[PDB]
Design a protein around this ligand. Structure first.
Ligand SMILES: C[C@]12CCc3c(ccc4cc(O)ccc34)[C@@H]1CCC2=O
Ligand SMILES: C[C@]12CCc3c(ccc4cc(O)ccc34)[C@@H]1CCC2=O
Lengths: 129, 129
């Protein structure tokens, strides 16, 4: 069925673990084949697993990116949820920390149907030498 | 124009301060007149300043509620934002805390057009002596 509030907490938390180790295949596996991703939210969406794979491929590939949950996954009873997290990566040649909040909606199959990542430069922190 | 990312950070943070002191009148003024609220997200929406004011009236009235930002407001460049916060209130006779994530979309006037609060009982913590 549609993931319960507790299942969602578990799914969204796993998601972060997978991004953290850059397991693109396992990441794409969590998505629905016609899922849509907005990241950063505000930018035109990307549709389908293929473009979504391509996104995580270039986003987590080449660079050195880590990500961690920085708080509890908030979860509703309609297969949706929202989490706070921190993405570490090189931004403009310098290591930086990015504060993000992802909102996910899941389908009756436990897969991500909608994904929106709220962040921008105001949330970017460059790590000084 | 549509609030810049930095303006979005200011608006949403101010909103929490307003909720915190129970200023229903200032709160409502932040909302567009035909704004929609889904709180909790998953439940049927309420539309319009009149029903929104009634919602905050009963939500913040009678009870003794507190709210505080527990992390940075994540803001996009297209007039949206999400924030983590902590709401304190009396639940089932006992003081409790609720972990919430609010997502808001503002209109070109800087007023809240759309609001969704993500939380369920899995985000509820009853507080000992
Ligand atoms: C895309 C990115 C790496 C991965 C990533 C970013 C931002 C938000 C994210 C949200 C996610 O749920 C998963 C990965 C990212 C970074 C912003 C700049 C960049 O290097
Ligand atoms: C409504 C409420 C008090 C206020 C409140 C709750 C939940 C989410 C909120 C989100 C807000 O942005 C502002 C206020 C609340 C509580 C749920 C139970 C209750 O006591």
């Amino acid at each position: 069925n549609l993931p319960t509030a507790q299942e969602v907490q578990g799914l969204m938390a796993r998601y972060i673990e997978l991004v953290d180790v850059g397991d693109i295949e396992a990441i794409v596996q969590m998505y629905a084949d016609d899922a849509t991703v907005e990241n950063p939210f505000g930018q035109p969406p990307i549709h389908g697993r293929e473009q979504i794979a391509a996104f995580y491929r270039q986003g987590l590939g080449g660079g050195k990116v880590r990500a961690s949950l920085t708080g509890p996954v908030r979860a509703s009873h309609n297969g949706s949820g929202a989490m706070p997290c921190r993405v570490e990566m090189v931004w403009n040649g310098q290591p930086s920390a990015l504060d993000v909040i992802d909102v996910m909606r899941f389908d009756e199959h436990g897969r991500i149907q909608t994904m929106q990542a709220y962040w921008s430069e105001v949330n970017l922190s460059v790590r000084e030498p």
